[PDB]
């Protein structure tokens, strides 16, 4: 008449650590920053980001 | 004037092992959009069950 399937109880998920600590203190906290028209274009690669 | 009595082999198979397929499963499982689009195509799953 049917099937019997046994339905997962719960759901989890795993991911490999969160590595090479992307900065984003320096940039969005410094003593100095650039000017409006001489602004400085920071980039941020090789990292997974938080 | 003489006689030899020889025995011969002879192999017919019989039956082979019954299967019966999870339909609903093998479509695709744990699903609700699945039971939506299956539901939907009348009957190509209880023909073949």
């Known amino acids: ?6 339905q997962p109880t719960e759901s989890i998920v795993r991911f490999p650590n969160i590595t090479n600590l992307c900065p984003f203190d ?10 409006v028209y001489a602004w400085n274009r920071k980039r941020i690669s ?3 980001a938080d | 004037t003489n006689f030899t009595i020889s025995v ?3 192999i017919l198979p019989v039956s082979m ?13 744990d699903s609700t959009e699945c039971s939506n ?3 939907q195509y009348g009957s190509f799953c209880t023909q073949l069950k």
């Open chain 2, 37 to 39: 689009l299956l539901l």
């Open chain 2, 8 to 10: 011969t082999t002879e």
């Open chain 1, 26 to 35: 320096e940039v969005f906290n410094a003593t100095r920053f650039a000017s």
């Open chain 1, 1 to 6: 008449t049917s099937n019997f399937r046994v």
């Open chain 2, 17 to 29: 092992t019954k299967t019966s397929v999870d339909c609903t499963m093998y479509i695709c499982g």
């Open chain 1, 46 to 48: 090789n990292c997974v």
